[PDB]
C-alpha cells in the first residue's frame, strides 16, 4: 500500500526515497532508471523495490474518515 521501509533482499532503507523518486520523475523529467541510479539504488533488488511499488494509500485516502475528531 505504502512504500516499504526496508528492501526485502538486503535491508537497505528505501522508504525515504519515494517522494524524491516521484519528484525526479515529474519535475526533472528523468527516466525511471536514471532516477533510481541518482537516488543511490545500485542493486536491482532495491531498484525493483522502488520501481514496482504501487501506491494504494493514495486511493484509500479518498474515502471519508470513518470516525471524526
Amino acid at each position: 500500500m505504502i512504500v516499504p521501509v526496508r528492501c526485502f533482499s538486503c535491508g537497505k532503507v528505501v522508504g525515504d526515497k519515494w517522494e524524491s523518486y516521484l519528484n525526479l520523475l515529474q519535475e526533472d523529467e528523468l527516466d525511471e532508471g536514471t532516477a533510481l541510479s541518482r537516488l543511490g539504488l545500485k542493486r536491482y533488488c532495491c531498484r525493483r523495490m522502488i520501481l514496482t511499488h504501487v501506491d494504494l494509500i493514495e486511493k484509500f485516502l479518498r474515502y471519508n474518515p470513518l470516525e471524526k475528531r
Partner: protein
C-alpha cells in the same frame, strides 16, 4: 601486528571498501556473518496505540515503525530487558519515543520518522534519535493522513541482534569476493563457446595479475586477499560496524574459552 592486513580502497559514511589480506577464508566468512547477524542495535520493539483512525492497520504501522533505523552508537551502555531488573522497562534498558500526528490540513499530510519525540532519559547517551539520511531532512515515510485522521502511539525500543529479527540488522549488502581470476579453480565456469568471452571480468581483476597463460595449475595455493565492501543502514558508522563485528566474534570465542575453563574447574 604481523597478522591479517587491511587496505582501504574507498571510505564513506555509508560504504567502506577494503582488502583483507593474509587471512583465512573461514575467518573472512565468519567476519561477514557476524557483521550481518550479531551486531547489537537499537530498534523499536513494542508499540502501544492510543488513537488510530488511519486507513492503515495497527500491526502495519507497528511493523513499519519497528523497521525504522535508530541511532546505536552508545548501544553498549544500554542493557538487555531480559537481563535488567525492572517490571516491564526502564531508562537503563529501553528508550521511549512518542508519535502524535493530526490531519490539520486539507491536503494529505505525511508522518515521517522525524516526528518521533524521545520522552525518556537518555542519561547523556547517543542512542534513540532516528537516522535522517535525505536532503529534505525528513526520514522514512511512516504513513499518510487526510483531514480529520489522527495517529497517536508510544514506542518502546530495546537493544537486540538481527538473529532475533532482521529489524536490528545494522549492515546492508556486503560485497565479498576472492580470487577474481579463478586461479584456485574453485569454480567451473559455465559457457557455450568461450567462457572468458562469455563471463564479464570482475572489477577486482585489476588488483591481481592475470594467469601466466601456460603455467601449471598451482595446487599449493590457498584462498586469501579478500575484497570486501560493507554497506550500513545508518544505525552505526560503517567503520564501527566492522570494529564491532570483530569485537563480537572475539567475545564469542572468549566465551567458548571461559566455558571450557569453567568445566575444567569442575
Amino acid at each position: 601486528s604481523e597478522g591479517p592486513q587491511v587496505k582501504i580502497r574507498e571510505a564513506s559514511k555509508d560504504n567502506v571498501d577494503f582488502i583483507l589480506s593474509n587471512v583465512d577464508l573461514a575467518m573472512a566468512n565468519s567476519l561477514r556473518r557476524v557483521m550481518i547477524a550479531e551486531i547489537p542495535t537499537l530498534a523499536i520493539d513494542s508499540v502501544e496505540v492510543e488513537t488510530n483512525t488511519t486507513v492503515l492497520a495497527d500491526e502495519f504501522i507497528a511493523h513499519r515503525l519497528g523497521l525504522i533505523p535508530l541511532q546505536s552508537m552508545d548501544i553498549e551502555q544500554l542493557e538487555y530487558s531480559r537481563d535488567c531488573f525492572c517490571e516491564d522497562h526502564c531508562d537503563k534498558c529501553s528508550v521511549v519515543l512518542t508519535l502524535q500526528a493530526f490531519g490539520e490540513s486539507e491536503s494529505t499530510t505525511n508522518v515521517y520518522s522525524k516526528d518521533l519525540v524521545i520522552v525518556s532519559n537518555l542519561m547523556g547517551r547517543n542512542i534513540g534519535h532516528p537516522i535522517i539520511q535525505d536532503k529534505e531532512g525528513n526520514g522514512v515515510l511512516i504513513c499518510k493522513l487526510r483531514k480529520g485522521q489522527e495517529l497517536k502511539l508510544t514506542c518502546v525500543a530495546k537493544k537486540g541482534i538481527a538473529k532475533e529479527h532482521a529489524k536490528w540488522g545494522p549492515a546492508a549488502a556486503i560485497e565479498f569476493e576472492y580470487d577474481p581470476w579463478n586461479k584456485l579453480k574453485h569454480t567451473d565456469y559455465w559457457y557455450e563457446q568461450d567462457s572468458a568471452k562469455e563471463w564479464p571480468q570482475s572489477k577486482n581483476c585489476e588488483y591481481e595479475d592475470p594467469p601466466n597463460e601456460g603455467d601449471p595449475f598451482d595446487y599449493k595455493a590457498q584462498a586469501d586477499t579478500f575484497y570486501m565492501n560493507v554497506e550500513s543502514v545508518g544505525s552505526i558508522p560503517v567503520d564501527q560496524v566492522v570494529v564491532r563485528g570483530i569485537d563480537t566474534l572475539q567475545k564469542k570465542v572468549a566465551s567458548i574459552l571461559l566455558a571450557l575453563t569453567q568445566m575444567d574447574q569442575d
